[PDB]
Amino acid sequence: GAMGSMERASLIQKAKLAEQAERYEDMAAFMKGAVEKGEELSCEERNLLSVAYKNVVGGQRAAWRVLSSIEQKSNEEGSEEKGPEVREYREKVETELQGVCDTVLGLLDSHLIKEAGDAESRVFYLKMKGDYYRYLAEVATGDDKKRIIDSARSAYQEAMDISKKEMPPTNPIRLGLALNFSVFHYEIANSPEEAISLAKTTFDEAMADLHTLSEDSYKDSTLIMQLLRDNLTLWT
Amino acid sequence: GAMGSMERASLIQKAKLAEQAERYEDMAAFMKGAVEKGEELSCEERNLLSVAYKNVVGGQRAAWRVLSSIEQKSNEEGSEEKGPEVREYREKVETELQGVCDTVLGLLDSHLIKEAGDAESRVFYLKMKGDYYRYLAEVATGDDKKRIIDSARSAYQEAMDISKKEMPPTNPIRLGLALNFSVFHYEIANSPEEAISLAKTTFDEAMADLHTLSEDSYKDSTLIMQLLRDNLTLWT
Amino acid sequence: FPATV
Amino acid sequence: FPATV
Ligand SMILES: *CC(=O)N1CCC2(CC1)CN(C(=O)C1(Nc3ccc(Cl)cc3)CCOCC1)C2
Ligand SMILES: *CC(=O)N1CCC2(CC1)CN(C(=O)C1(Nc3ccc(Cl)cc3)CCOCC1)C2
Ligand SMILES: [Mg+2]
Ligand SMILES: [Mg+2]
Ligand SMILES: [Mg+2]
Ligand SMILES: [Mg+2]
Ligand SMILES: [Mg+2]
Ligand SMILES: [Mg+2]
């Protein structure tokens, strides 16, 4: 890989610079280089990795949705035929998106998850595995769509099982996992009741544990609790 | 080039899709493909080309400024030595920026300018030549900095000479050229008095010609006149 | 779209 | 920074 000659610490330093410059493709490439050094990642490093790819794929998903909407409009009654270009360009963006998801899933499988023994690391990586399978599911229309959905579900479920056993209900990783799994249920699995139940139970169990927290932890937890409430408001 | 197999009309169609998806790197690559077909560009096509590269280089300039500021801070008294990484990454972004500018200048030289005979096309391309030399000048620190500055000046001057002879004072291309040349004077040529004189004379001559315009042309002209006023307000 | 982190 | 188009 192109980052093979760069020191691990230099890659991490440059990832932080790239973040400040809002250069998320660079940030992701630096973090990929850092993962490929083969050492485990610290908490801060895990977050850099996630921030970088979340931003890259987030932009691709937004572009894909714009193009998909145009494509859907082209296939309505009365719409003038404009040739293959809309499908082609949507496919181009889709393929690039799938490539990024496959890259992230590859890092997780080789070998981040298998070396992650602490709950905070293992849950975080399994949540990411769920997330990137969910992004694949968003664009899937073929033979493998059910398997892709199941891969997302399985990863999220393993993460949920560990989080419930090993983390307090206010832990931000536990909360963010539940938030995202709830969205999986609503948007991917056609399970809005499960989505709503999960978000409500997560919120309520967190509420009950806030009393144990410092001011700074309270701020962290309540921010994600508000995201749960926002989704509940959207869905009810 | 990778776009050599794609129809000109398909490239233009996809550039428009890329714009809607805020995929400006793609938009630029599509427009580069379209220019390389060798036919002259319509007004709409010239604007697509300019929009695409303006957005790509604009992002690179913003990133370069973030990194340059960090680098400058690192070279102040009391700042802890952090190694070569900040310089290296600023250099990386700088090199990519210079590459994009060289690409645009290359399109203009091979062969957009030489085939542009109408004032609207020729002025527009010469303004772009000034603009991309100005972006090169922003990052230049070596033997050639004076020549780069002069290349920008020369292009802007030729564009100004044609615009004054061939276009009304409210023409948006004439106004945008004057706006940008004024900024060249202020930011690149260390000539704030010339910048202010140009912006004021341009504004005032445009004001006097508004009476000749339709409602829609008035809206177009006055928008750019407001940019001139905004700069004047900043500078006085 | 709904919130995710 | 100043306005350009
Ligand atoms: C070291 C570690 O595990 N992390 C991930 C959690 C984090 C610190 C770094 C707290 N945090 C957040 O609260 C936000 N992002 C986020 C939360 C939860 C997960 Cl699972 C992933 C990301 C909350 C949303 O706004 C950004 C920070 C990052
Ligand atoms: C066909 C043609 O020459 N053009 C360039 C001028 C334009 C229509 C397409 C009007 N216009 C603008 O008013 C804005 N951009 C712009 C103005 C002037 C120049 Cl020289 C370049 C660009 C004004 C700023 O906001 C975007 C439109 C594009
Ligand atoms: Mg080493
Ligand atoms: Mg496909
Ligand atoms: Mg359950
Ligand atoms: Mg042809
Ligand atoms: Mg350099
Ligand atoms: Mg003069």
Residue B186 near residue D2 (C-beta atoms within 8 A): yes
Question: Domains in chain A and their CATH numbers?
Answer: 8-235 (1.20.190.20)
Resolution in A: 1.4
Element of type H or E holding B173: helix B172-183
Residue A181 near residue A198 (C-beta atoms within 8 A): yes
Q: What are the tokens at A205?
A: 């169990």
Which residues of D lie closer than 8 Å to B, measured between beta carbons? 2-5
**CA nearest neighbour of A93 among A60, A49, A57, A51:** A60
> What b/e sequence results for A106-128 when a residue is b if at least 16 CB atoms lie within 10 Å of its CB, and e otherwise?
ebbeeebbeebeebbbbbbbbbb
- Alpha carbons B133 and A105: distance in angstroms, whole number: 42
First to last CA, chain A: 48
Place of tokens 């709950």: A119
Collapsed DSSP state (helix, strand, coil) of residue B214: coil
Element of type H or E holding B203: helix B192-207
The answer to whether A231 faces chain C, any CB pair under 8 Å, is yes
Report angle CA B166, B168, B170 to the nearest 5 degrees: 140
Question: One-letter amino acid identity for A63?
Answer: A
Q: What are the tokens at B36?
A: 């390389």
**CA nearest neighbour of A149 among A157, A158, A140:** A140
Q: Determine phi and psi for B144, rounding to 5 degrees.
A: -100, 0
Q: What are the tokens at B148?
A: 């780069």
Query: Cβ–Cβ of A17/B70 closer than 8 Å?
Result: yes
Quote the DSSP letter at residue B213: S
Place of tokens 């197999």: B5
Residue B44 near residue B52 (C-beta atoms within 8 A): no
DSSP chain A: -TTTTS-HHHHHHHHHHHHHTT-HHHHHHHHHHHHTT-SPPPHHHHHHHHHHHHHHHHHHHHHHHHHHHHHHHHTSTTPPP--SHHHHHHHHHHHHHHHHHHHHHHHIIIIIHHH--SHHHHHHHHHHHHHHHHHHHHH--STTHHHHHHHHHHHHHHHHHHHHHHS-TT-HHHHHHHHHHHHIIIIISS-HHHHHHHHHHHHHHHHTTGGGS-HHHHHHHHHHHHHHHHHHHHH-
Query: At how many degrees (to 10) do helices B119-139 and B145-166 cross?
Result: 160
- Look at the alpha carbons of B134, B109, B175, B41 in this order and tell me if their dihedral is positive or negative: negative
**CA nearest neighbour of B85 among A78, A15, A213, A109:** A15
Q: Determine the residue of B31, B42, B47, B228 to mutate for testing ligand 2's pocket, defined as the one with the most ligand atoms within 8 A of the Cβ atom.
A: B47
- Look at the alpha carbons of B206, B209, B211, B216 in this order and tell me if their dihedral is positive or negative: negative
